[model samples]
Target: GGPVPPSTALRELIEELVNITQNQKAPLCNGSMVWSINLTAGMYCAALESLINVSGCSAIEKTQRMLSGFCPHKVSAGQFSSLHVRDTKIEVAQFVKDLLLHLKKLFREGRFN
Candidate 1:
């Protein structure tokens, strides 16, 4: 009963990406934008879940596996914490791009119906 339409899910993902890019330095301290990675991770998980529920496509299993391989773990504050900010942003961006590709593939295959 929790299935979400694929179009709606994709819209949510895009909106999230926009939010992450537009407000990378708001409501958080300087150099702390790394936390946005967690938010992006959450969006990916939710989007995947929605897609799987609505489409019941076998390809989603592969996407799930891909997501499993991605590391969205939180970066704690401590020594050398600042050094990881840029790397974290890059990693998050890459993961988002990968997920977007998969979503687009599904969309193209007419899985959103």
Candidate 2:
């Protein structure tokens, strides 16, 4: 309602995630699989829904502390993508980029907050 509506840059989040992924040295969360998230308002929490299960990896620990945790309840199992398994064991960096790139798209489309 002021001069210009403050449009948050979705680029902001992506860079931060990208920075850490670049900075990380160890393999993330043992390259273990987690639930793939659909980028949206629910994504931070919904993606973290799967992330919280895999423990003690600083890669995602930083991500968890910084980027996620708005939703106050459990994510709907039926809502997120079907849990991918027994195929490629993707590291969190890979997974992180997936969410990041997708989120960038969503934000560009004005679909993300």
Candidate 3:
């Protein structure tokens, strides 16, 4: 059931997420940052990379499920030798937009392709 889509969807999701992060002033992660990421492999897989690490944010729960559909296969463990979640306080939304912007760079550059 894989469609030749998810590209648009991902971008839209980013925009929606970016809006929330930018508009809101409160900390998204309460001074916590989940694992930053990029390239689940661009398109749907890629952008959802870092956003998935978020936990306990009700605002983006809808966004979370949206990614669930696009990326059916979970990002498996053992991708990078179990690196630690370091240098992270960024609110959930803040981190998403922050890394989201960077993630887009890699996507457009075909970082994973």
Candidate 4:
């Protein structure tokens, strides 16, 4: 099932995740990075789908900005095209989990918490 869509701005959503993790009695094992990427991936997927659903030359430029914003190093002219954007979004989504896991571990082991 899909998680509930949050109404807050992106930065607030990230902050909320950090606050929840830090304050939870058992420490929920997830943090700002997890929420940030989840929100980012969802936006990426939606933008990709919108590009797919509509037909035009403009989508290339639109997708390029979206792709570059997420992982600037991996983006290129060809990747901005709809076919590649759809494919790349999946690979990008996979990174979110690993990033979340790393953040969780960091929060658990760090003394700042």
Candidate 5:
């Protein structure tokens, strides 16, 4: 999260999203973000594997499993979670609008974009 907006004023928010194929860092291809808990553990296991010897290492050798499966569309790779998809588009639109307004403000003063 970034810094809070000053004085409760509305600020333009930009959201970015990547497809599931691009978000392969998560466990299985059809895993939910809610299963991120196990993903985190997998990350830890990988790190431990690198630091500690893998031979006879119980933690490193354990198979990683997802607590739940997900539909590919359920993946949330955007600014907020997948639940914020609507607001993500809305906020990005607002950002462009605000950007143009700021550029126009600057243009009147002979500044550039």
Candidate 6:
């Protein structure tokens, strides 16, 4: 069974985000901020796999589509070139908060697990 508790699920998601961010390499240039292709694809595949394990294969395609929209440039074949540059710290924090809230809502609605 997937995380039965909302708190656990949130923690899991946060941890995954941390792992992803921690693995990001330094910015390529003053204006070039990006995640490595391996890191991006790795994280996406990991998350998609997890979702499939908990949800199902049917969710895999949808999750991929959603991830592309979330950070399309995260997956690029370059040292420091991507479609999206890193956002400000405040914006990133807010994004995390919003994501947490969304996850909480899903949990509350019994969509998870």
Which candidate's lDDT is highest? 2
TM-scores for all predictions: 0.27, 0.58, 0.48, 0.22, 0.20, 0.27
Candidate 3: C-alpha lDDT = 0.52
**Local accuracy by lDDT, each model:** 0.39, 0.57, 0.52, 0.34, 0.24, 0.36
Candidate 3 lDDT over 3-108, as tens digits, reads: 5544764576457656655755666656455544333343343334455555676666565566556563555233544354343333554556754565456445
Q: Output the better candidate (1/5) by TM-score.
A: 1
lDDT of 2 by residue, 1-113 (tens): 46733455555656756665565555455767665664535666645666666666665665564445444455533454655322444566566777667655665666654
* Top TM-score hit: 2
**Residue 9, candidate 4: alpha-carbon lDDT:** 35
Q: How well is each residue in 21-65 modelled by candidate 6, as lDDT tens digits?
A: 343343111222122122322344323322222222232244334
* Residue 16 Cα positional deviation in candidate 2, in Å, after optimal superposition: 1.3
Cα error, residue 48 of model 2, in Å, equals 0.8
The per-residue C-alpha lDDT of model 2 at residue 2 equals 67
Would you list the clashing residue pairs of candidate 6?
none
lDDT of 1: 0.39
lDDT computed for candidate 4: 0.34
Task: Look at candidate 2 and tell me the lDDT of residue 19.
Answer: 68
Q: In candidate 5, where is summed lDDT lowest over 10 consecutive residues? A: 12-21
Candidate closer to the true structure by lDDT (higher is better), 1 or 5: 1
Instruction: Tell me which of candidates 2 and 3 scores higher on TM-score.
Output: 2
Model 3 stretches astray by more than 4 angstroms? 1-11, 40-56, 75-94, 102-113
Q: What shift in Å separates residue 25 of candidate 5 from its native position after superposition? A: 35
lDDT of 2: 0.57
